[PDB]
Amino acid sequence: RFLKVKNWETDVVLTDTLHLKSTLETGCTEHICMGSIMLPVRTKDQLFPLAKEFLDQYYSSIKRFGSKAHMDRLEEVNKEIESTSTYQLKDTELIYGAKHAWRNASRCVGRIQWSKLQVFDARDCTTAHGMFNYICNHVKYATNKGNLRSAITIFPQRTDGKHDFRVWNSQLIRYAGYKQPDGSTLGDPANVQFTEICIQQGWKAPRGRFDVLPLLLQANGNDPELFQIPPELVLEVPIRHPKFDWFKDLGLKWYGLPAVSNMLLEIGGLEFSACPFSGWYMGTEIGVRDYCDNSRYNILEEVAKKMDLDMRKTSSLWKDQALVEINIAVLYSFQSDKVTIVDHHSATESFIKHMENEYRCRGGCPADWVWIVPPMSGSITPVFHQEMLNYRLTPSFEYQPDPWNTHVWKG
Amino acid sequence: RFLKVKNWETDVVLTDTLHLKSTLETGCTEHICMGSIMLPTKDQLFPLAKEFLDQYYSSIKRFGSKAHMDRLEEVNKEIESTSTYQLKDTELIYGAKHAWRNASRCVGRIQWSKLQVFDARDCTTAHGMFNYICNHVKYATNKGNLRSAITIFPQRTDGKHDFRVWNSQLIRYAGYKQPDGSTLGDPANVQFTEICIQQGWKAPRGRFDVLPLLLQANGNDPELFQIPPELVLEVPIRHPKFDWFKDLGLKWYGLPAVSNMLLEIGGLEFSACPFSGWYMGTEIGVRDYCDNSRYNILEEVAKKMDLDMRKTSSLWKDQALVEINIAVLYSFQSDKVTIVDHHSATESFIKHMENEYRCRGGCPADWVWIVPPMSGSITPVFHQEMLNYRLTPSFEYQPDPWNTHVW
Numbered sequence A: 001r002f003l004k005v006k007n008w009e010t011d012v013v014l015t016d017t018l019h020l021k022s023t024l025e026t027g028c029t030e031h032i033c034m035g036s037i038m039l040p041v042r043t044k045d046q047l048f049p050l051a052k053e054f055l056d057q058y059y060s061s062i063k064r065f066g067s068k069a070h071m072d073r074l075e076e077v078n079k080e081i082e083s084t085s086t087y088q089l090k091d092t093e094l095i096y097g098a099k100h101a102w103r104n105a106s107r108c109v110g111r112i113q114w115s116k117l118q119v120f121d122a123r124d125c126t127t128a129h130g131m132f133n134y135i136c137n138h139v140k141y142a143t144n145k146g147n148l149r150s151a152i153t154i155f156p157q158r159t160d161g162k163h164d165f166r167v168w169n170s171q172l173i174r175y176a177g178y179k180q181p182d183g184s185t186l187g188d189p190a191n192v193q194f195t196e197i198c199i200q201q202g203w204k205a206p207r208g209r210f211d212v213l214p215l216l217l218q219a220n221g222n223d224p225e226l227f228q229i230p231p232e233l234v235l236e237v238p239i240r241h242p243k244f245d246w247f248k249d250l251g252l253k254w255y256g257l258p259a260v261s262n263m264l265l266e267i268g269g270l271e272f273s274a275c276p277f278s279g280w281y282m283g284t285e286i287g288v289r290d291y292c293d294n295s296r297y298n299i300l301e302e303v304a305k306k307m308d309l310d311m312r313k314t315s316s317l318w319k320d321q322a323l324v325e326i327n328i329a330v331l332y333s334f335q336s337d338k339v340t341i342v343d344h345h346s347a348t349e350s351f352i353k354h355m356e357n358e359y360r361c362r363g364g365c366p367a368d369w370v371w372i373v374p375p376m377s378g379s380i381t382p383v384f385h386q387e388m389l390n391y392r393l394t395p396s397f398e399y400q401p402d403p404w405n406t407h408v409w410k411g
Numbered sequence B: 001r002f003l004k005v006k007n008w009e010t011d012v013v014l015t016d017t018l019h020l021k022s023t024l025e026t027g028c029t030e031h032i033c034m035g036s037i038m039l040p041t042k043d044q045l046f047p048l049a050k051e052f053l054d055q056y057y058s059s060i061k062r063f064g065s066k067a068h069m070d071r072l073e074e075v076n077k078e079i080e081s082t083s084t085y086q087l088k089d090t091e092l093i094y095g096a097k098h099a100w101r102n103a104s105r106c107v108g109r110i111q112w113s114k115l116q117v118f119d120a121r122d123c124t125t126a127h128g129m130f131n132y133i134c135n136h137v138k139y140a141t142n143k144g145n146l147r148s149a150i151t152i153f154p155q156r157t158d159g160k161h162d163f164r165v166w167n168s169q170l171i172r173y174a175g176y177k178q179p180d181g182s183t184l185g186d187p188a189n190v191q192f193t194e195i196c197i198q199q200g201w202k203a204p205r206g207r208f209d210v211l212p213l214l215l216q217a218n219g220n221d222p223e224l225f226q227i228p229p230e231l232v233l234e235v236p237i238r239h240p241k242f243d244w245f246k247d248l249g250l251k252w253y254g255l256p257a258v259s260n261m262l263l264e265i266g267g268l269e270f271s272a273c274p275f276s277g278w279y280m281g282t283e284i285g286v287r288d289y290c291d292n293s294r295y296n297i298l299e300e301v302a303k304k305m306d307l308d309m310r311k312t313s314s315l316w317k318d319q320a321l322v323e324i325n326i327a328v329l330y331s332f333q334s335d336k337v338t339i340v341d342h343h344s345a346t347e348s349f350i351k352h353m354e355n356e357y358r359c360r361g362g363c364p365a366d367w368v369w370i371v372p373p374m375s376g377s378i379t380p381v382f383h384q385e386m387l388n389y390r391l392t393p394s395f396e397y398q399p400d401p402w403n404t405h406v407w
């Protein structure tokens, strides 16, 4: 079967066949659409088909489908599963797998970049100290003094679910949040709970507005351990505005390296529960969400006060006006310090070209519109006008519950 | 089967049960989500009638009463005999209000119960349609103090005698392709404009020419009427700070009025049912003015503001956008024509959502449409999970009549 998507700005129509390869379910039914819901040990039995499907894909991609090398590899994985109940990926399969999980990530607007990903194989890691070293090298490599490079570090896969490698941090770099006795929050309100866990595990909190959190790392199912990232490895950008000289005095800064550390990478039925990956920021992630969400740094009022906007009615659009100025400031600062960043116009334009390419060469591009459309100026970006089909391909990145809810403590 | 929706800003979780009464299909499956696709007999009719009358009699706290059973009986009688049936006035009003209540793409539904319904089921000609529509326009406009209204023409019979308003909205500007290669007026209305000229309209050939109505009665060929100019309330657009803004020569109309949709009540189909409320500012300032395929004015405004248009990263587009939207709101407010900003509208809808969860067990909502086309995440709807499903009575999209009509 074929499915069509139309761009309502250009009348360009694309034909999707790739959705035929989708197996995993979406949360939607014929009677209900869950497209805006945020979250909508395997047996040998279920493992071999998953391994086979993956290796078929891998072998097709290298133009060796059906070859003796293909067949030997299938047989070899089959026997490995048969007798050890799991199997190990070759380096080449691991790289391909991690690239494809990104390629298949339907909420990611940055996917034009998917084939340039530096993959760090950390499958020989055995301890939390070992994980700390690997993550430091990843940060330094990815950061590259401002010329950011995409990378992923992949720790040992799940075995019995009792020996998981996990990075407890949600992102490798994030600022502490501290709930005050008066109910106010100092620092980032999104990280309060994790900040409390770190303190409890023994971290000495400086208690300021922009304290980089320590890493909390679990190797092989053991209790997690605390490590501080060397400050010299944490690139930060002080935020200032090209025309507004009072902007610097708000005291804002942000880190350059966006790096997700809480997701699960699935490749051929294998589960990599610690797989931190990084790219570079789109400006709106910081300037719209991190700075302006009511439940985050929430700076809109203070910014619009200083711009002396009329704040007595929402209809003066004071929030919208202050929002644009903040986002100009974030982009200006990163640019001035030579730290890679992309604006939402450029990123969405690139994504449309990427999506069109994928439709030609691949037969589709699963995309989640809710997430792809930027959180400001939606309809003056080309993605707003683009119909998209969302479905689930493997390899994939998956959400997993926070480990403090599930961890069995050794004490 | 009992589903939760969470607000990620506030942590409020609501439980939706109303979705189980959902009837029609979404386009989505367990394998593929189509949330962002714009368009995803006697035997059939009695179940639809029963379903509706059951909910009607339930709403007036008379479920299972003799009068309930008596009506079900009467409608049953009427369908078997005549192959259709007629709604009571009370049923028609209820159904109309509920079609709006069930419109999952509508941010303004806190208002749903204040809808003036004009019963035009006695209309027989296109001249009559015209009279009805002017009266609707004048009632709804109310000298700038807008009131929600719908006018409901006769229901589908055998489908060869449909009433249709050919216009997509009651009030729209003409579009003309030019020798120049460009487009004069609203590019969204070129085709319909051509049909008007084709049908006889003498186009003024200006940038903001109010289109005439093309009305079809009883499946006849459609006829042309100009809405009395004095009933079409328009607003000149000025900015409170940029004195040059008015020099762009921009105006928009005060009355948003959808005329191309099909109202379905108790299985009956009302193919001409124009309805109106009042604008949310972004519809005009973001979409009408700034869509590339619309009036597309961003460049001209940014130039007058002397912004650095050299690089996208200066956010010149975003800056000019906010300004255009400030000007729309200000102009409507200055001339006292009802308008709502996206902050106030979305705040109202969140309150409406909580009322509907508390009082009905849910509220079908389409997040892709509800979230405003600018400043998404600074409105509360951005952080609200929504379930989208189809309830009847409903408004449904229908194909442009010129594709269906045999002359």
Ligand code: HEM
Pocket (backbone or CB within 6 Å): A098, A102, A105, A107, A108, A109, A110, A111, A113, A117, A150, A151, A152, A277, A278, A279, A280, A281, A282, A285, A342, A347, A371, A397
């Ligand atoms: C290279 C520059 C990149 C840019 C500009 C970019 C852009 C984005 C943005 C804006 C989001 C939404 C983030 C949010 O709203 O919180 C996102 C989500 C995501 N991207 Fe990227 N991306 C990049 C690289 C990567 C890389 C390297 C990977 C992994 C290999 C990746 C996989 C994802 C995934 C899995 C999500 C969904 C995250 C979630 O559900 O929390 N992206 N991307």
Ligand code: HEM
Pocket (backbone or CB within 6 Å): B100, B103, B105, B106, B107, B108, B109, B111, B115, B148, B149, B150, B275, B276, B277, B278, B279, B280, B283, B340, B345, B369, B395
């Ligand atoms: C009272 C003020 C009202 C406001 C502020 C309002 C708000 C809106 C907005 C902003 C949209 C999106 C339209 C677009 O993006 O093009 C919309 C869609 C819609 N509203 Fe309303 N609404 C109002 C009244 C009404 C009334 C009176 C009805 C019916 C009686 C109605 C039914 C609809 C329907 C069916 C849609 C979807 C239209 C489509 O698919 O093209 N609304 N509403």
Ligand SMILES: Cc1cc(N)nc(CCc2cccc([C@H](N)Cc3cc(C)cc(N)n3)c2)c1
Pocket (backbone or CB within 6 Å): A038, A039, A110, A171, A258, A259, A260, A277, A278, A279, A280, A281, A282, A285, A399
């Ligand atoms: C590689 C990369 C590049 C780039 N430009 N940006 C990023 C930032 C990604 C990110 C950061 C913080 C929080 C979230 C998301 N908010 C985290 C989240 C939370 C929940 C509940 C569900 C879910 N699926 N996700 C996602 C990463």
Ligand SMILES: Cc1cc(N)nc(CCc2cccc([C@H](N)Cc3cc(C)cc(N)n3)c2)c1
Pocket (backbone or CB within 6 Å): B038, B039, B169, B256, B257, B258, B275, B276, B277, B278, B279, B280, B283, B397
């Ligand atoms: C009552 C009311 C109040 C209000 N504030 N706004 C409105 C705007 C109505 C409207 C106007 C232009 C275009 C469309 C819609 N974009 C027209 C349309 C096109 C297609 C292809 C599908 C589809 N479902 N709809 C809908 C109405």
Ligand SMILES: C[C@H](O)[C@H](O)[C@H]1CNc2nc(N)[nH]c(=O)c2N1
Pocket (backbone or CB within 6 Å): A035, A036, A037, A038, A370, A371, A372, B008, B382, B383, B384, B385, B386
């Ligand atoms: C409820 C809703 O799905 C939620 O607020 C989503 C909307 N779109 C998003 N889009 C992106 N890129 N990131 C997000 O975190 C969200 N949050």
Ligand SMILES: C[C@H](O)[C@H](O)[C@H]1CNc2nc(N)[nH]c(=O)c2N1
Pocket (backbone or CB within 6 Å): A008, A384, A385, A386, A387, A388, B035, B036, B037, B038, B368, B369, B370
């Ligand atoms: C393709 C996508 O569904 C389309 O651009 C939608 C997005 N959201 C919208 N939202 C509203 N309110 N109105 C629209 O016309 C659209 N268009």
Ligand SMILES: [Zn+2]
Pocket (backbone or CB within 6 Å): A028, A032, A033, A034, A035, B028, B029, B032, B033, B034, B035
């Ligand atoms: Zn869906």
